[PDB]
Design a binder for this molecule. Structure first.
Ligand code: F43
Ligand SMILES: C[C@@H](OP(=O)(O)O)[C@H](NC(=O)CCCCCCS)C(=O)O
Ligand SMILES: O=S(=O)(O)CCS
Ligand SMILES: O=S(=O)(O)CCS
Ligand SMILES: [Mg+2]
Ligand SMILES: [Mg+2]
Ligand SMILES: [Mg+2]
Ligand SMILES: [Mg+2]
Ligand SMILES: [Mg+2]
Ligand SMILES: [Mg+2]
Ligand SMILES: [Mg+2]
Ligand SMILES: [Zn+2]
Lengths: 548, 246, 442, 548, 110
């Protein structure tokens, strides 16, 4: 059958994708593009309005001496210019990040113990449901105890709420389903079994604070906001004095002893509090993505939906804005989620492994790394040599490095069932690619790559860690594009081939299984397309409080 | 002990609340059962719940400090720590927030007192809290119009009185009766209805409020005219300032 | 001697040990026992061999609720503890007869580790203790079982957690009384980031010993911060002696006189009477039925008032056997004593202010928690320069079981390991002995 | 003339402001309020659409047993319910913080030295203008060198630009005036000469990144995004190789050696990167506020405009959201910028000082602190005692403590011309207030207050600092409401009485003298009222890229 | 002398103090050394350089054997120089906080 990227290549260029030569310089520069024309016209209107020159196509070099391509968002039939995938221009991408940033998981297990022991009061499904009505009034920023409080406008904060989950079906089935993330409904039976056994009789809140507040403030706001309104709702629903010594145990539990942040804080050169992208480990990012519970018959689709989630968040918003900015890193990321290119390469590797070893049945060793990662690396590179249109599409060497090594690392992990030999296969891919073409990525691309082999299996203080625990703050990884989201894919790959319900944290997996999110985490690439088409409706806007 | 400087009635009243040798005037009789109901922590005839086992069951190592310090009776028993909280009107209630915490730590053992503008609280072992609470409710610490027993929703210290002379209470825990002139407690301190109300006696008249109040105000005794009390505040300021420098 | 002051030192039963000891014999800069305590707390690690084994068997590594399915490793670590500990010791020590200690506890489930002092004399800070211990035990466990290159990174995760993705050793199965250098509120604060519950657990809830260890750590931090340099040095040394070392038996005797029926206010009256009797304060001025007191030695008045404050905490929270009211004692002891006397309270108002925020953050929704989770580096309790947190330690030593976040809940690993160490467990004893020993060298 | 709060009190209550008695419980609870009625209806609509209960006026206790008051925004004739002053409901308040977060000051001094000495090229006004045209194309997120770049939509980033300023008039006037903050146009003559003397021949950029990016990301993004596009524009405008060794000197200069952040990063318990509210020192907040250059004839107006700036940012957004959240701290802050109350007290103290000493003529000593702070404290407190409607308006003791002590501390600093004695007067005010009424603030209000006197003049490591250099991270100030914005007013007070052009940093003062900002920093209270009326137009919205 | 304290371009108008610190370097250094040292004749070194414009300071090693880390060097040094400057000129309580800012900067706000 046609390689999976042929349809996109045929959409992009007049020539067939095998053709070796073309014509350039005849497209009228930016004038070939609907989006660039929109931008030129908007630039003139902005500069007049404000009295300062702004976007101008004649400053600097003239874009569009070649074709300015459309991109197919992989797994869709949506084709857009790449500017519609820039996170600034895509409200789905911004909301994906807000939905992670404004979430925190907060136990009720210490809290219910404080109620039973210090206060000497009972906790039941009834009292939990009362508490949940109370906290769902309070969490978006409304009052429950004091007179003369002034509150948030409910429609500005309509995306904030609190749900719960528990592995105890007796309690879960009894609460108003309005407040419950129901594991049995959300997950297929095998996975639900696993998840309920991990959670047991623990009861956990999934708290989402308002998008408008997360945008005004920062990620480190989330757990504090959550704990203040849990605290008020504990006082109101359990009839404490409104501020007695036991009130402090609820605060310590909700802020520290039973909180799960999405991200941990960062070192000072890249100082950031909790719930910022750099603090989100790769295992959590794979668990936030909800492809695992929908597409579990297809480990490739689960793994590459994780890669899309991570490439966009880690490269476009994190490295391309928080850690840099400007035009940024759209296409360093879109190479991993468009034109079905990574999908072609990764399905080849899955096929290879399934036929040779069977999924998860290869020895977990260097022999398997050398076999699978070399075979898949040579397949991906041969596609760029056989399809000149594919090479002109993924024109930057970094893009190609990330894509070919993601397919090689994911396939290696589909063979071994272990992410660490997956990661070794990523690095070997890079070394083979560098020798094959006498280039790899950008000037700084392979800092991590050359440290890579030696740190995959190290055990030393700031070197040794299973891949699932690594993230954008692992030292070698802290700077460079074209790695982090692919590593989240490698982290997902062995667990998707094994059929595991989660990669690193079962609470995080359950906490995103919720259709009351604004972004649909089951279909990340579909959402990116919807945002690119200007059809996604984000939360957080101020239109209600601004003039017509 | 001296307790407080100044030569006003306010100052003397601040000293009398602190001084455990000053006999607080008793103004009203309240039954033990009704103190329990107003506290709201346990029901009539309910045994004291425990937070830990009795001290004698615990077999602790030798500790000279613990051996020297006699535990209050509720600590010997392992009682929960519970609270009572009061709000005092700025319109001349007899006690006020810092007056209460200062007095409590001179009069009462084993006490965790907290002061705020709109509420003042003590937390201690439950059977001991019921004995202190009788005294806080029956004596001139309390007036049933200008002071309120309130575990939540405390607004009113700074509000205008109503036409009956009663402080505002969002939850209307204390009701004056227009025909009879007595206040009744109709809810416990957290706002739940009592099966039967508790009579709290008559509001103190204006003259008696002025005799007994511990707040300074331009329309009562102004703090700025109690020049000896101001001198000591200013002294403290200046001595802390110099000591923090050198 | 820079200072002429002498103090009498007692044991924790109120018996005299040594009379007329020069003040500087108690200085952290001179006293060899405070040196050994501080270098001990830099170099001592608790290793939870059972916890490492369990984290590996379940693949629950990297922090709360985290697990990696398929990564389980079943290793008989506790059953081979003796061998593992000896091999870790060979990597930990510098030479074979140095002061490295590696001692199994709990049938091999735990190990006390003291990394040799000399590693620290060539180090900037104190992180060599957890980092040298962690790698020596990771390597010893790998070498005991010949764990493969493909699996060994799970042993690393079970010992040290999610570091370096996390800044902290998140999910680690080792523990120290110190916390990482990045968590200091300011430079010089590391001896202040020691949970109150860890101090109370190391001293087995002996009230005087908890107050002494806390004081020694807090006032030693005051030297490292530069607070006890120059004008302020004597103030800090006298606070250490009188508030934390029971100098002249002042704390002890106050508690004895007020323990049966006393209150914060009765302890104030007794301390004011003792300060007057000793000549530390005198009447300066008579107002209308009100004596205004003065002092010609503010550091000594501060110290006497600090001893009274510790006694008042012991009386107040000792009578309740409940620690929570320490925040109120710290507040109103100081607020009452200033209106009782006309003189400034302990630390010139900064205990009182620490107590206002500590009271709020131990009885509200906004943060903090119970007394035992604070420390001198906590934002709520950092403001007084050593004169507040030792009272919190005394109060938690006297708590009979009212806390959810008690030392049993937060500090059990610390307690098993660090209370083995005599100088951590009974520091009042060792610091007084060392002061008596160097008495004639000051 | 009547006290300045009397009109507000007559608007709020039917009784005369002196009347001691009223009626409660007859207003129908929330039904008395237009805004609560809007909220009850919106909560029904939000809950029905999303299938989770939300705002419910019957949860917890029933608001409006007393009058739910309007507030007059001080210095305006706008009266609004306090919910309209909550930062979530007020787009002007959100934009004020966005405009600070997204700004960074970046020298061209080291940069121009690199160009002359290292590249061996000349800098003149002409090359500076050409660099400014280039960076105003690139800063909002558009390309100048590479082919096939995808860019931000110019209309989503219309608020991002770069201007410059210099103290050399002849150089300023040679650069294209579209890009220049003109010191002589913006400042009255004496202040303009002071500022130009501070700057000298130095040349500085004021860089504002897009609000939509700042809201997506965080404050620590601002200096990075700035430097990326400065770097691209130095490549394009001075004809560098696009990535050579000298490129890294422009990166280090723009990111470190000549950057001035609005806020410094925070320690780990409250971890945050740069350009977050807690890092903004009080002297910078007074300099950001532009009342000094417009209302210089009236030092009370200047000082209390800075109090409004700071009470909103530091108590509502920073302490009430970044550091807590929920319903938060609206009225803790509104007490300092509504009903002309703080204005009445502070004019009293300014006239007292004029009559007894003369502005800035009192000795800078404790005698002056005891005289002025005591007199002004008693005036303020007597107003609450004379006017029961005023006490019922500022019903929380913390609000009164902050208002009375701000008037006392600003008046002490108007007397001495020195902010340190102003700060001593603030603490003495609290101690007198506490003894007068036997109360002060909330449980934790006076932690800094009791440490306060001893730490005013301390010189120890984490104790001693002139007030202008303190901020929300000064240890004693790091937690509590009702202090930080008032301290920024006291830092402004002696400088407004002296006629100083700035309080702590002349570059920050100039950097906000710019009508291209979205928020008008010359009239902070006017803008707060505009936002309360839903008449402010913020930047950053996603309407262009979302469904019509 | 310029009131330029607290970081790049920062100044507080009206706070200037004109103190002849370099002309009195020897006395200031000696007074700082007495606070820095633990004992007389220990390993504390305070040596003037550049005719009193600079001082090399080596804080005694014993202060580090009773410290967790190394911040006692700048902290003990800064405070001994701040106090020796204040004591050399009799700087008032009202003004001394500017000496502190000129030594150690915007810490602890930064
Ligand atoms: C539960 C606490 C303890 C705690 O940790 N925080 C609370 C409650 C909290 C909640 C109240 C929201 C609600 O009703 O659901 C919020 C809004 C914080 C949040 N979670 O959003 C808050 N206080 Ni409180 N809090 C306030 C205040 C106060 C004053 C109110 C005194 C009075 O007489 O009304 C007192 C402290 C004092 O006595 O000085 C106070 C207490 C308290 N404060 C008592 C509840 C008092 C009661 O039972 O009525 N706040 C104030 O003094 C004014 C500003 C006001 C804040 C809201 C705003 O700024 O708009 C609010 C700030
Ligand atoms: C104390 C500290 O909380 P923790 O004790 O660390 O949970 C801190 N919060 C605060 O300071 C709350 C400040 C705003 C709320 C109270 C205003 S009075 C913080 O979250 O970092
Ligand atoms: O040219 S560089 O490799 O320095 C940067 C690529 S975006
Ligand atoms: O009641 S508390 O002082 O704890 C909180 C006030 S918002
Ligand atoms: Mg049902
Ligand atoms: Mg959906
Ligand atoms: Mg949808
Ligand atoms: Mg009776
Ligand atoms: Mg006499
Ligand atoms: Mg007069
Ligand atoms: Mg304008
Ligand atoms: Zn943001």
């Amino acid at each position: 059958a046609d390689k999976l990227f042929i349809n996109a290549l045929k959409k992009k260029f007049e020539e067939s994708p095998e053709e070796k030569k073309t014509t350039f310089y005849t497209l009228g520069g930016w004038k070939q593009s609907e989006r660039k024309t929109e931008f030129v016209n908007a630039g003139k209107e902005v500069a007049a309005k404000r009295g300062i020159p702004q976007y101008n196509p004649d400053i600097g070099t003239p874009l569009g001496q070649r074709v300015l391509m459309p991109y197919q968002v992989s797994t869709t039939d949506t084709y857009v210019e790449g500017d519609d995938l820039h996170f600034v221009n895509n409200a789905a991408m911004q909301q994906m990040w807000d939905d992670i940033r404004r979430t925190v998981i907060v136990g009720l297990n210490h809290a219910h113990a404080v109620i039973e022991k210090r206060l000497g009061k009972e906790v039941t499904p009834e009292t939990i449901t009362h508490y949940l009505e109370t906290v769902n009034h309070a969490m978006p920023g409304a009052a429950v105890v004091q007179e003369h409080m002034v509150e948030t406008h409910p429609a500005l904060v309509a995306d904030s709420y609190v749900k719960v989950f528990t592995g105890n079906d007796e309690i879960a089935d009894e609460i108003d389903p309005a407040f419950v993330i129901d594991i049995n409904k959300q997950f297929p039976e095998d996975q639900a079994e696993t998840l309920k056994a991990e959670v047991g009789d623990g009861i956990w809140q999934v708290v989402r604070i308002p998008t408008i507040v997360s945008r005004t403030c920062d990620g480190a706001t989330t757990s504090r906001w959550s704990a203040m309104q849990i605290g008020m709702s504990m006082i109101s629903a359990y009839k404490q004095a409104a501020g007695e010594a036991a009130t402090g145990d609820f605060a310590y539990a909700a802020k520290h002893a039973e909180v799960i942040h999405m991200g941990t804080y960062l070192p000072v050169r890249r100082a950031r509090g909790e719930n910022e992208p750099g603090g989100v480990p790769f295992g959590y990012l794979a668990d936030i993505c909800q492809s695992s519970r929908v597409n579990y018959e297809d480990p490739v689709r689960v793994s590459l939906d994780v890669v899309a989630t991570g490439a966009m968040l880690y490269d476009q918003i994190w490295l391309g804005s928080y850690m840099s900015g400007g035009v940024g890193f759209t296409q360093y990321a879109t190479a991993a989620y468009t034109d079905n290119i990574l999908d072609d390469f990764t399905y080849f590797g899955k096929e290879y492994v399934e036929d040779k070893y069977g999924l998860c049945e290869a020895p977990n060793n260097m022999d398997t790394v050398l076999d699978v990662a070399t075979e898949v690396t040579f397949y991906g590179l041969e596609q760029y040599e056989e399809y000149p249109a594919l090479l002109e599409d993924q024109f930057g060497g970094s893009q190609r490095a990330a894509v070919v090594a993601a397919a090689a690392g994911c396939s290696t992990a589909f063979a071994t069932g272990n992410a660490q030999t997956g990661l070794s296969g990523w690095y070997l891919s890079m070394y083979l690619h560098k020798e094959q073409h006498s280039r790899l990525g950008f000037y700084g691309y392979d800092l991590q790559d050359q440290c890579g082999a030696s740190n995959v299996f190290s055990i030393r203080g700031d070197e040794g860690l299973p891949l699932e625990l690594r993230g954008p703050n692992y030292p070698n990884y802290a700077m460079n594009v074209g790695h982090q989201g692919e590593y989240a894919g490698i982290s997902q790959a062995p667990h998707a081939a094994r059929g595991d319900a989660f990669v690193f944290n079962p609470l995080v997996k359950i906490a995103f299984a919720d259709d009351n999110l604004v972004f649909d985490f089951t279909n990340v690439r579909g959402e990116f397309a919807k945002g690119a088409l200007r059809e996604f409706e984000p939360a957080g806007e101020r239109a209600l409080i601004t003039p017509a | 002990a001296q307790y407080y400087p100044g030569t006003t009635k306010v100052a003397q009243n601040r000293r009398n609340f602190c001084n455990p040798e000053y006999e607080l005037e008793k103004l009203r009789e309240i039954s033990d059962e009704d103190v329990v109901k107003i506290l709201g922590h346990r029901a009539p005839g309910e045994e004291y719940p425990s937070v830990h086992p009795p001290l004698e069951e615990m077999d602790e190592p030798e500790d000279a400090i613990r051996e020297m310090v006699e535990p209050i009776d509720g600590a010997k028993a392992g009682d929960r720590v519970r609270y009572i909280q009061f709000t005092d009107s700025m319109y001349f209630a007899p006690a006020q927030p810092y007056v209460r915490s200062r007095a409590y730590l001179c009069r009462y053992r084993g006490a965790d007192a907290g002061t705020l503008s709109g509420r003042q609280i003590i937390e201690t072992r439950e059977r001991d809290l019921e004995k202190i609470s009788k005294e806080l409710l029956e004596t001139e610490f309390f007036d049933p119009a200008r002071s309120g027993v309130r575990g939540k929703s405390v607004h009113g210290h700074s509000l205008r009185l109503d036409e009956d002379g009663m402080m505002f209470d969002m939850l209307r825990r204390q009701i004056y009766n227009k025909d009879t002139g007595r206040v009744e407690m109709v809810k416990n301190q957290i706002g739940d209805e009592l099966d039967e109300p508790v009579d709290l006696g008559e509001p103190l008249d204006e003259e008696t409020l002025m005799e007994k109040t511990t707040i300074y105000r331009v329309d009562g005794e102004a703090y700025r005219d109690d020049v000896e009390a101001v001198e000591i505040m200013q002294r403290i300021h200046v001595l802390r300032s110099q000591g923090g420098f050198n | 001697a820079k200072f002429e002051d002498k103090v009498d030192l007692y044991d924790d039963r109120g018996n005299l040990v040594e009379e007329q000891v020069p003040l500087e014999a108690l200085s952290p800069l001179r006293n060899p026992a405070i040196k050994s305590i501080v270098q001990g707390i830099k170099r001592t690690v608790a290793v939870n061999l059972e916890g490492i084994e369990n984290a590996l068997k379940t693949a629950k590594v990297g922090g709360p609720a985290c697990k990696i399915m398929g990564r389980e490793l079943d290793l008989d670590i506790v059953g081979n503890a003796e061998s593992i500990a000896a091999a870790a010791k060979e990597m930990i020590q510098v030479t074979e007869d140095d002061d490295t200690n590696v001692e199994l506890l709990g049938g091999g489930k735990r190990a006390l580790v003291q990394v040799p002092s000399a590693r620290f004399d060539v180090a900037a800070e104190y992180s060599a203790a957890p980092l040298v211990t962690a790698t020596a035990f990771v390597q010893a466990i790998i070498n005991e079982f010949d764990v493969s290159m493909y699996d060994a990174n799970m042993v690393k995760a079970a010992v040290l957690g999610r570091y370096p993705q996390s800044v902290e050793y998140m999910g680690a199965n080792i523990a120290t009384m110190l916390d990482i250098p990045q968590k200091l509120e300011g430079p010089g604060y590391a001896l202040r980031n020691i949970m109150v519950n860890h101090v109370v657990a190391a001293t087995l809830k002996n009230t005087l010993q908890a107050a002494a260890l806390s004081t020694i750590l807090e006032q030693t931090a005051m030297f490292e911060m530069g607070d006890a340099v120059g004008a302020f040095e004597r103030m800090h040394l006298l606070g250490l002696a009188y508030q934390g070392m029971n100098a002249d038996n002042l704390v002890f005797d106050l508690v004895k006189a007020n323990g049966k029926e006393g209150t914060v206010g009765s302890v104030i009256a007794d301390l004011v009477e003792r300060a007057l009797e000793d000549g530390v304060i005198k009447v300066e001025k008579e107002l209308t039925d009100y004596k205004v007191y003065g002092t010609d030695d503010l550091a000594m008045w501060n110290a006497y008032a600090a001893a009274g404050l510790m006694a008042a905490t012991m009386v107040n929270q000792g009578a309740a056997r409940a620690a929570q009211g320490v925040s109120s004692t710290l507040l109103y002891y100081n607020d009452l004593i200033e209106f009782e006397t006309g003189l400034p309270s302990v630390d010139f108002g900064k205990v009182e202010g620490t107590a206002v925020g500590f009271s709020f953050f131990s009885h509200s929704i906004y943060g903090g928690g119970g007394p035992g989770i604070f420390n001198g580096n906590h934002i709520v309790t950092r403001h007084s320069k050593g004169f507040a947190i030792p009272c919190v330690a005394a109060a938690m030593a006297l708590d009979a079981g009212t806390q959810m976040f008690s030392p049993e809940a937060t500090s059990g690993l610390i307690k098993e390991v660090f209370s083995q160490v005599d100088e951590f467990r009974e520091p009042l004893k060792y610091v007084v002995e060392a002061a008596a020993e160097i008495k004639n060298e000051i």
